[PDB]
Design a protein around this ligand. Structure first.
Ligand SMILES: Cc1ccc(OCC(=O)N2CC[NH+](C)CC2)cc1
Ligand SMILES: Cc1ccc(OCC(=O)N2CC[NH+](C)CC2)cc1
Lengths: 304, 304
């Protein structure tokens, strides 16, 4: 029993973290096979951070300008290319600790683990969700750029996020491992606003199921609702619309608890309308939306 | 910026996890040098779980009765001994992935990372605190026994916790790596009640400092208090007494923010008396007590 915000074990990713230095800028790179991936803004100077022309900045750069260190030992860079907002540095050594891996672009509401790194060294692991406004709410200090987000399927690491920057509001933006930003963000030192940070409804429902499974059931009510009625309440409370695809994904949690998805929606509706009244669910005084249905099944079944 | 419940990177501990099987019971062991540590209740049968006499159960056991698997490969057990509530299994192979390590017994209020494991395989990492009643609030399914709690000092792993059991209330009890239970708990299938789960005051203050550092400052008030006045309020709200030792430890957070410790205590006093009024701090609707002053400095300074 017990329900914790739980990250994937980070060992497989720790073995991929390197330091990349260009000029006076040091951040993190991900070393998979004979390629090191990092934020392209590693080449950026104070002058150009406002309106950087990355193709022009890169003309001034050679292989030997990129210093790649894996521990207290240097890697030889034998090629470099820009793919969207990432640099790929070809090195002469395949990372011997390269795990089975994929690059995936996640949808908003999907959760992943972040290994926060500084100078190619892991400092910490935490769990977070791609917000519906394509920001994440991380913990990133200067030097954390190139830190990655991942999910682990048994022994296969799916890399979904590379950290690039902090918005003036102190929320975080980054790319997939093809260098494409989540959301409308650009690797530029211009004020950029996030849109509405809506609540991930399906994830709240999953965590309500986790709560019932773990014996926190005070909030279960006598009501049901319909997807249309629920969604009217959702929209009013800045909750993402619930689709039949979401209802389908919640099916196994429904089956385990014997609580129909629409019944749990009606319980959530009353929690939105009435608030928690100083009570907690799974030790939270607000409705948690950074567990997916997959996370709840995983944690409640013990997948390794 | 941003403040996350952050675990230590778990790689160094992943490399120490093994499966231990005695009869039909399988749980986790920690393989350091040529010793495997696990809960002694691995020898326990349905018959004896109510009033197990471990010394008597162990007479019936030989080295070859303990099956130790590290991956899909078996370790040869060449000795076994009981130390308090742990079995030490001597194996013929030193774990080649043995990190620099210590065994430490932590105090209540101290935080650590748990690598939740099943069949010697890591499933997840999360952060938790030794509660003042010497329970922890984990996420442990059957087969998770032998999962360990640790802190990581640069490259040295301090092991502080081994998981042993779940109380009827679904909170968790375990030992240090010398096999001594935290709290008054015994490795026996008898109903055992936890004492008062009080709030770790010093940890709340540390997290209030983290909040200010991260620009969440709405709760800062015009008041100060004294340790005696604060502690009268603390006791009424089931908060642990604040000592001068706690004030001393908060000194650097005081220094960084320019908020005197007693001023932050007065802010906390008003939050206890007035509640949060539907506002959040660092995205929590309640006062978080599972960050130590050390954790806040670490996360707010980027230690690897
Ligand atoms: C995409 C990106 C990459 C690198 C950046 O570096 C920020 C920087 O160097 N500053 C320090 C001095 N401040 C006054 C201005 C910002 C910012 C954004
Ligand atoms: C310290 C400890 C070690 C092993 C335990 O195993 C519990 C068990 O086998 N049960 C399953 C069947 N239940 C009806 C009764 C409990 C319990 C406590």
């Amino acid at each position: 029993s017990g329900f914790r915000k739980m990250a994937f074990p980070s060992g497989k990713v720790e073995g991929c973290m390197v330091q990349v230095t260009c000029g006076t800028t040091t951040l993190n790179g991900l070393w998979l096979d004979d390629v090191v991936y990092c934020p392209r803004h590693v080449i950026c100077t104070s002058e150009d951070m406002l309106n950087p022309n990355y193709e022009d900045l890169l003309i001034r750069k050679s292989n030997h300008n990129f210093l790649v260190q894996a521990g207290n030992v240097q890697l030889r860079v034998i090629g470099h290319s820009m793919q969207n907002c990432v640099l790929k540095l070809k090195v002469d050594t395949a990372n011997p600790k390269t795990p089975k891996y994929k690059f995936v672009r996640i949808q908003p509401g999907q959760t992943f683990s972040v290994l926060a790194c500084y100078n190619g060294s892991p400092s910490g692991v935490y769990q977070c969700a791609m917000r519906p406004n394509f920001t994440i709410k991380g913990s990133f200090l200067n030097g954390s750029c190139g830190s990655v987000g991942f999910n682990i399927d048994y022994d296969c690491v799916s890399f979904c996020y590379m950290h690039h920057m902090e918005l003036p509001t102190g929320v975080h933006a980054g790319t997939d491992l093809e260098g494409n930003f989540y959301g409308p963000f650009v690797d530029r030192q211009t004020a950029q606003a996030a849109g509405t940070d809506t609540t991930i409804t399906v994830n709240v429902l999953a965590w309500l199921y986790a709560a019932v499974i773990n014996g926190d059931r005070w909030f279960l009510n006598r009501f049901t609702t319909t997807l249309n009625d629920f969604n009217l309440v959702a929209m009013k409370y800045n909750y993402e619309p619930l689709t039949q695809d979401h209802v389908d994904i919640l099916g196994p949690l429904s089956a385990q608890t014997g609580i129909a998805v629409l019944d749990m929606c009606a319980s959530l509706k009353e929690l939105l309308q009435n608030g928690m009244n100083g009570r907690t669910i799974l030790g939270s005084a607000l409705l948690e939306d950074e567990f997916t249905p997959f996370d709840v099944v995983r944690q409640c079944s013990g997948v390794t």
